């Protein structure tokens, strides 16, 4: 986006002042939309020395004579040319600027406009800056942040020592990664993205996207009237064990609820019988095992069952022991179908196998599984989109790194999902998503498309739960999937 601004100025010829003007008025309009008539409110605008502060001077100036009171506290020690120009305008228009922040000053104002730091933030916030940000956070005033809440790293969403907690953030051109990833997503509050005049061709040249309702609607496969189950594909799910008998059921119904024609589970006997006692629409094939876990002795039977399907999902509730490891890796090495690899199949995966496979794969780890897979700490991998990209590219796969914001990448294109809620923070919810992904692949979507549609729908079904989110379970989530699909059109 910094390249976007500079191309818009230097190559398209839009004066940098025009961009800054448009940015500032966008903030005023956004605030009006959110607060109603502005004329009753008193505004305290906190301006740094950079262009974020310059946008703040534009805000301040456009509120003069229209609101109850405006005051700018200028917190920097030199001004960029556009900030300087706009400071000069604010003052020529009769605006008051002070350079000392007084704790009690919060008292005489209703709204704080946070134009201290935007994308130009570098390093931890300390000193007076930190104190002022902590004072604003303690104040209980309405806070509107310009571009990004000051203290959020716009590339990662990390907090740099301290950051502003905004009620409303107005950003320009496109959402920034730091609005999308936590903690920054939380500090952003309500996000509005304003068009400030960049050419549409530049705005669309960005390669990292938020998954939106319109994108998912255009990816939903068709349902031609003259169809039959085979039109909508076939999934095999290899899942479960004597310890984990529920996982297969949740994955299986996940595929059926998104419209797959046929779903077959391969589960150790007698645990396979659990699935059809719940949902008799499922086929649950009994696998004879020595000790209740898949092993190499089941390899041939599973490959055989794979012949008649379009996609295989593997991993939920398999357990993680050496015989599962041998089986999973030899299976995936020979399977010549797209594979969705989850849970214990990731825990025992040899990544060399992904490089050997001619057929596609999707991997669906949470950060603990991703950490073990690449031999790093959870903290190293969580919300680490660049590592996810690198991984997907090196291993020729789609990687779906699950968290409150889920990252979906094939190494070239990266998408972020922001649907869902804490009801999904409960065992079983990942198992459902695995079935959803396999299902959409079976229906004809690419691995990346299937993953994109599934993470969105999965999170949106969670939001449709009627009662408090914390009581959502996977079985209820299943019931909500078709309502999510209906609402998506």
């Amino acid at each position: 986006m910094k390249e976007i601004d500079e191309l818009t100025i230097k190559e398209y010829g839009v004066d940098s002042r025009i961009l800054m003007e448009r940015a500032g008025i966008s903030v005023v309009l956004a605030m009006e939309e959110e607060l109603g008539n502005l004329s009753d409110y008193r505004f305290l605008v906190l301006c740094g020395g950079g262009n974020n502060g310059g946008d703040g001077f534009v805000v301040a100036r456009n509120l003069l004579g229209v609101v109850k009171d405006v005051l700018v506290v200028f917190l920097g020690k030199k001004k960029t040319p556009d900030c300087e120009y706009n400071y000069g305008l604010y003052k020529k228009f009769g605006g008051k600027v002070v350079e000392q922040f007084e704790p009690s000053i919060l008292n005489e104002f209703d709204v704080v406009v946070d134009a201290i730091f935007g994308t130009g933030l570098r390093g931890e916030i300390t000193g007076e800056y930190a104190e002022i940000i902590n004072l604003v956070n303690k104040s209980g005033k309405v806070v509107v942040s310009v571009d990004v809440p000051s203290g959020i790293d716009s590339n990662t969403g990390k907090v740099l020592r301290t950051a502003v907690k905004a009620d409303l953030t107005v950003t320009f051109g496109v959402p920034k990664i730091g609005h999308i990833l936590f903690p920054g997503r939380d500090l952003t509050g309500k996000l509005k993205v304003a068009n400030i005049g960049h050419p549409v061709h530049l705005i669309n040249s960005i390669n990292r996207y938020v998954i939106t309702r319109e994108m998912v609607r255009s990816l939903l496969p068709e349902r031609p009237r003259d169809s039959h189950k085979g039109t909508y594909g076939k999934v095999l799910i290899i899942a479960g064990s004597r310890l984990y008998s529920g996982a297969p059921v949740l994955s299986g119904m996940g595929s059926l609820k998104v419209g797959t024609g046929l779903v077959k589970l391969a589960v150790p006997f007698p645990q396979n019988l659990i699935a059809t006692s719940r949902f008799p629409e499922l086929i649950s094939v009994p696998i004879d095992t020595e000790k209740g876990f898949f092993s190499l002795q089941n390899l041939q039977e599973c490959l055989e069952l794979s012949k008649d399907v379009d996609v295989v999902a593997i991993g939920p509730g398999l357990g993680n022991n050496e015989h599962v490891r041998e089986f999973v890796n030899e299976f995936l090495k020979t399977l010549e179908k797209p594979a969705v690899i989850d849970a214990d199949a990731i825990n025992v995966l040899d990544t060399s196998v992904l490089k050997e496979r001619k057929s596609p794969a999707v991997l669906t780890p949470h950060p603990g599984e991703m950490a073990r897979l690449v031999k790093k700490t959870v903290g190293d991998v969580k919300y680490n989109y660049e590592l996810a990209e690198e991984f997907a590219k090196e291993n020729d796969c789609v990687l779906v790194l699950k968290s409150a914001t889920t990252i979906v990448t094939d190494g070239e294109k990266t998408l972020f999902n922001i649907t869902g809620n804490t009801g999904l923070s409960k065992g079983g919810s990942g198992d459902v998503l695995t079935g959803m992904i396999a299902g959409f692949i079976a229906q004809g979507l690419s691995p990346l498309e299937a993953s994109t549609v599934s993470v969105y729908l999965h999170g949106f079904a969670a939001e449709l739960f009627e009662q408090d989110e914390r009581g959502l379970t996977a079985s209820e989530l299943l019931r909500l999937i078709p309502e999510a699909i209906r609402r998506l059109k």
Partner: peptide, 7 residues
């Protein structure tokens, strides 16, 4: 609704 703001 959408020329200025995306939600």
């Amino acid at each position: 609704a959408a020329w200025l703001f995306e939600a």
